[PDB]
Design an enzyme around this catalytic site. Structure first.
Site, short mmCIF file in Angstrom:
data_model
loop_
_atom_site.label_atom_id
_atom_site.label_comp_id
_atom_site.label_asym_id
_atom_site.label_seq_id
_atom_site.Cartn_x
_atom_site.Cartn_y
_atom_site.Cartn_z
N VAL A 7 19.27 -15.81 -63.14
CA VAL A 7 17.99 -15.14 -63.54
C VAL A 7 18.38 -14.05 -64.56
O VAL A 7 19.25 -13.32 -64.03
CB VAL A 7 17.10 -15.17 -62.42
CG1 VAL A 7 15.78 -14.48 -62.72
CG2 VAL A 7 16.87 -16.22 -61.70
N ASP B 220 9.61 -22.51 -49.41
CA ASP B 220 10.58 -21.36 -49.43
C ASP B 220 9.93 -20.11 -49.39
O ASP B 220 10.37 -19.42 -50.07
CB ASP B 220 11.56 -21.72 -50.70
CG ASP B 220 13.01 -21.00 -50.54
OD1 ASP B 220 13.23 -20.71 -49.59
OD2 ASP B 220 13.63 -20.91 -51.48
N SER C 142 21.11 -21.76 -60.46
CA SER C 142 20.57 -21.00 -61.35
C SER C 142 21.04 -19.59 -61.68
O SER C 142 21.55 -19.23 -60.73
CB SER C 142 19.08 -21.31 -61.52
OG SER C 142 18.45 -20.21 -60.40
N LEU D 74 19.84 -10.62 -63.47
CA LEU D 74 19.11 -10.16 -62.51
C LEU D 74 19.37 -10.69 -61.05
O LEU D 74 19.71 -9.85 -60.07
CB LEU D 74 17.60 -10.38 -62.72
CG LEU D 74 16.57 -9.88 -63.47
CD1 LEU D 74 15.21 -10.35 -63.60
CD2 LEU D 74 16.49 -8.11 -63.47
O1 LIG Z 1 12.19 -21.25 -59.13
C1 LIG Z 1 12.00 -20.19 -59.56
C2 LIG Z 1 12.99 -19.05 -59.27
C3 LIG Z 1 12.61 -18.04 -59.70
C4 LIG Z 1 13.58 -16.72 -59.67
C5 LIG Z 1 13.30 -15.93 -60.61
O2 LIG Z 1 13.74 -16.39 -61.85
C6 LIG Z 1 13.66 -14.48 -60.02
O3 LIG Z 1 12.98 -13.26 -60.66
C7 LIG Z 1 11.63 -13.81 -61.14
C8 LIG Z 1 10.83 -15.00 -61.30
C9 LIG Z 1 9.57 -15.08 -61.73
C10 LIG Z 1 8.99 -14.07 -62.11
C11 LIG Z 1 9.70 -12.75 -62.36
O4 LIG Z 1 8.94 -11.65 -62.73
C12 LIG Z 1 10.81 -12.59 -61.84
O5 LIG Z 1 11.66 -11.19 -61.84
C13 LIG Z 1 11.75 -15.99 -60.44
C14 LIG Z 1 11.43 -17.67 -60.32
C15 LIG Z 1 10.70 -18.63 -60.37
C16 LIG Z 1 10.82 -19.97 -60.14
O6 LIG Z 1 9.91 -21.01 -60.24
#
Ligand SMILES: O=C1C=C2C[C@]3(O)COc4c(ccc(O)c4O)C3=C2C=C1O
Length: 334
Positions: free
Chosen positions: A52, A155, A50, A44
């Site tokens: 994703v 952030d 990191s 993604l």
């Molecule tokens: O530090 C992080 C970083 C992300 C980046 C990321 O992984 C991107 O995309 C996401 C997501 C969470 C839910 C979701 O539905 C989704 O698409 C994200 C996070 C949660 C965190 O605590």
């Protein structure tokens, strides 16, 4: 002589009166799930610390999002995990569904609920006045909650607000820079995206608090109602404060610095110049005026203030008349 010390005017001592284990994330013992429950489908996004992926939970064929945390200080990994667990079930807080690792390589990964996000660079183009008010209120619920729980997000930016528009569904994500607030603690000012950094970060005032997040939210609000993304566009950290000064003016900037006895890099005063405070109405044109109202400008004006102690709390923000129509429509008997 050093800068004047500061402390949050709300939720100041929430971690102080909670058990040690609440905020002492280094001593947290992770409860590990099963890595083989999840199958990676597609990448993604590439973070710098990191990666994703969209993934499926093969025990129920539900979509999830997996974030793999390559090397990095374990202490950072434990902070994000403890914060995500502390906050789970909170309004519009992204849900950490699982924590897993490669049983052989020991490499950890976070599993989050899946949110069918609308593109953002597209979405803001189609949002109505009511839509922006509604989503602002939802973001505020998240911030009041995490602040009430003793955590600064640090952030806040449009990329960290997932919006499934067809379900009116909003989640605040990316808690990787989030930190527990302790009164008197000197924090790292190297947080937030450049465009969303509060003035406290830009002048290296380290004893900041939850009010940092409210500046970032203000920057988001401005970009949405004025249709200018991002609203303050600096080419670096120094320039970023210049872009703010050109709208909020240098006089209130210098009163701020003076109040806290902050001590500025010599070359700052040369590039800051002298700038009058601009009326918010100056940013209203034919194309964005349908998103702008006097309640919107009054609301914005109370978020974007140099003095962190002067900004609205999330709770005060939620009480603003800007949100009257969304509050009536949200009182739900269910
Ligand atoms: O530090 C992080 C970083 C992300 C980046 C990321 O992984 C991107 O995309 C996401 C997501 C969470 C839910 C979701 O539905 C989704 O698409 C994200 C996070 C949660 C965190 O605590």
């Amino acid at each position: 002589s050093g800068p004047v010390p500061s402390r949050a005017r709300v939720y100041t001592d929430v971690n102080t009166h909670r058990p040690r284990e609440y905020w002492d994330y280094e001593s947290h013992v992770v409860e590990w799930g099963n890595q083989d429950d999840y199958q990676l489908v597609r990448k993604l996004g590439r973070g710098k610390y990191s990666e994703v992926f969209e993934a499926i939970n093969i025990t129920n064929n539900e979509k999830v999002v997996v974030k793999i945390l390559k090397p990095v200080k374990k202490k950072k990994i434990k902070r994000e995990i403890k914060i995500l667990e502390n906050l789970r079930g909170g309004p519009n807080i992204i849900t950490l569904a699982d924590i897993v690792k490669d049983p052989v390589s020991r490499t950890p990964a976070l599993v989050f609920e899946y949110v069918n996000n609308t593109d953002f660079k597209q979405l803001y183009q189609t949002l109505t006045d009511y839509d922006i008010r509604f989503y602002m209120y939802e973001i505020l619920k998240a911030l009041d909650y995490c602040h009430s729980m003793g955590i600064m997000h640090r952030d806040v930016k449009p990329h960290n607000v997932m919006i499934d528009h067809e379900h009116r569904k909003l989640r605040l994500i990316d808690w990787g820079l989030a930190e527990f607030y302790h009164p008197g603690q000197e924090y790292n000012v190297r947080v937030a995206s450049r465009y969303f950094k509060g003035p406290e970060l830009l002048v290296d005032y380290q004893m900041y608090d939850y009010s940092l997040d409210m500046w970032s939210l203000g920057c988001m609000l401005a970009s949405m109602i004025f249709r200018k993304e991002p609203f303050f566009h600096g080419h670096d950290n120094y320039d970023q404060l210049v872009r703010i000064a050109k709208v909020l003016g240098t006089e209130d900037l210098y009163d701020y610095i003076d109040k806290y006895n902050i001590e500025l890099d010599p070359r700052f005063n040369d590039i800051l110049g002298r700038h009058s405070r601009k009326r918010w109405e100056r940013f209203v044109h034919s194309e964005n005026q349908h998103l702008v109202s006097p309640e919107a400008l009054d609301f914005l004006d109370k978020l974007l203030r140099y003095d962190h102690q002067s900004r609205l709390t999330a709770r005060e923000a939620m009480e603003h008349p800007y949100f009257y129509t969304v509050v009536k429509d949200q009182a739900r008997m269910g």
